[PDB]
Amino acid sequence: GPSFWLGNETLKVPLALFALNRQRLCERLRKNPAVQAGSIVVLQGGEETQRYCTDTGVLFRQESFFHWAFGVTEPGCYGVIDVDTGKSTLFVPRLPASHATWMGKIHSKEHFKEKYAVDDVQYVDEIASVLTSQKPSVLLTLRGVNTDSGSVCREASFDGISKFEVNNTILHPEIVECRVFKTDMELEVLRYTNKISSEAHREVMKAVKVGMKEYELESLFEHYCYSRGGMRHSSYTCICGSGENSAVLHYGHAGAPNDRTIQNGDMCLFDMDGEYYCFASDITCSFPANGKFTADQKAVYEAVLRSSRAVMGAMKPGVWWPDMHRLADRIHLEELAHMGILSGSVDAMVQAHLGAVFMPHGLGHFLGIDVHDVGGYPEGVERIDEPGLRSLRTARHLQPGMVLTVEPGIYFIDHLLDEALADPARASFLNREVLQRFRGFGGVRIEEDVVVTDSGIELLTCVPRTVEEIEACMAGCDFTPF
Pairing of strands 166-167, 233-234: unpaired
9 is a contact residue toward its own copies (CB under 8 A): no
112 is a contact residue toward its own copies (CB under 8 A): no
Nearest to 111 by CA among 101, 121, 100: 121
Which listed residue (131, 175, 176, 249) binds ligand PRO by CB under 6 A? 249
Which listed residue (122, 194, 198, 235) binds its own copies by CB under 8 A? 235
Beta strands in 7-97 (DSSP E): 13-14, 40-44, 49-50, 57-58, 78-82, 88-92
Question: Please, which residue, 250 or 437, has the CB nearer to ligand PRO?
Answer: 250
Q: Which residue is nearest to ligand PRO (CB)?
A: 361
Question: Please, which residue, 225 or 363, has the CB nearer to ligand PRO?
Answer: 363
Q: Return all residues near 261 (Cβ < 8 A) that are at least 6 apart.
A: 211, 212, 213, 242
What count of other Cβ atoms lies within 10 Å of the Cβ of residue 355?
Answer: 25
- Work out what residue 365 binds among Na ion, its own copies, ligand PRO, none; the CB cut-off runs from 5 to 8 Å by kind: ligand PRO
111 carries a ligand binding annotation: no
447 carries a ligand binding annotation: yes
480 is a contact residue toward its own copies (CB under 8 A): no
Nearest to 230 by CA among 70, 55, 3: 3
271 is a contact residue toward Na ion (CB under 5 A): yes
Distance CA(350)–CA(10), nearest Å, equals 46
275 is a contact residue toward Na ion (CB under 5 A): no
DSSP state at residue 9: T
361 is a contact residue toward ligand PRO (CB under 6 A): yes
Question: Please, which residue, 288 or 362, has the CB nearer to ligand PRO?
Answer: 362
Site for ligand PRO in 291-350 (CB under 6 A): none
Binding segment toward its own copies, per CB under 8 A, in 250-258, 304-312, 316-324, 325-333: 250-258
Which listed residue (213, 292, 383, 465) binds its own copies by CB under 8 A? 213
DSSP helix/strand/coil, 387: coil
Distance CA(140)–CA(132), nearest Å, equals 14
Question: Please, which residue, 138 or 392, has the CB nearer to Mn ion?
Answer: 392
**In contact, 469 and 285? CB cutoff 8 Å:** no
Backbone phi, psi, residue 121, to 5°: -130, 135
Binding segment toward Na ion, per CB under 5 A, in 75-83, 171-179, 251-259, 279-287: 279-287
Distance CA(148)–CA(150), nearest Å, equals 6
Which listed residue (173, 317, 360, 378) binds its own copies by CB under 8 A? 360
Count of residues in the chain = 482
415 is a contact residue toward its own copies (CB under 8 A): yes
DSSP helix/strand/coil, 123: strand
Rounded alpha-carbon distances, angstroms, from residue 83 to 36, 171, 209, 357, 380: 9, 11, 56, 49, 26
Closest approach of ligand PRO to the CB of residue 250, in Å: 6
Closest approach of ligand PRO to the CB of residue 361, in Å: 4
Which listed residue (198, 297, 405, 461) binds Mn ion by CB under 5 A? 405
Question: Please, which residue, 4 or 358, has the CB nearer to Mn ion?
Answer: 358
Nearest to 73 by CA among 2, 168, 175: 2
**In contact, 164 and 136? CB cutoff 8 Å:** yes
Question: Please, which residue, 46 or 362, has the CB nearer to ligand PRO?
Answer: 362
Beta strands in 186-255 (DSSP E): 233-234, 239-242
- Work out what residue 173 binds among Mn ion, its own copies, ligand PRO, none; the CB cut-off runs from 5 to 8 Å by kind: none
418 is a contact residue toward its own copies (CB under 8 A): no
**In contact, 373 and 190? CB cutoff 8 Å:** no
Binding segment toward its own copies, per CB under 8 A, in 44-52, 378-386, 448-456, 460-468: 44-52
Distance CA(255)–CA(83), nearest Å, equals 46
Distance CA(271)–CA(249), nearest Å, equals 9
Q: Return all residues near 423 (Cβ < 8 A) that are at least 6 apart.
A: none
- Work out what residue 362 binds among ligand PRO, Na ion, its own copies, none; the CB cut-off runs from 5 to 8 Å by kind: ligand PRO
In whole angstroms, what separates CA 431 from the centre of its chain?
Answer: 37
407 carries a ligand binding annotation: yes
365 is a contact residue toward ligand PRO (CB under 6 A): yes
DSSP helix/strand/coil, 247: helix
Which listed residue (102, 379, 422, 436) binds its own copies by CB under 8 A? 102
Which listed residue (32, 227, 343, 466) binds its own copies by CB under 8 A? 227
Residues that bind Na ion (CB under 5 A): 271, 282, 407, 447
Binding-site positions for a dipeptide: 250, 282, 372, 393
Residues that bind ligand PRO (CB under 6 A): 249-250, 271, 361-362, 365, 393, 407
Binding-site positions for Mn(2+): 271, 282, 365, 407, 447
Binding-site positions: 250, 271, 282, 365, 372, 393, 407, 447
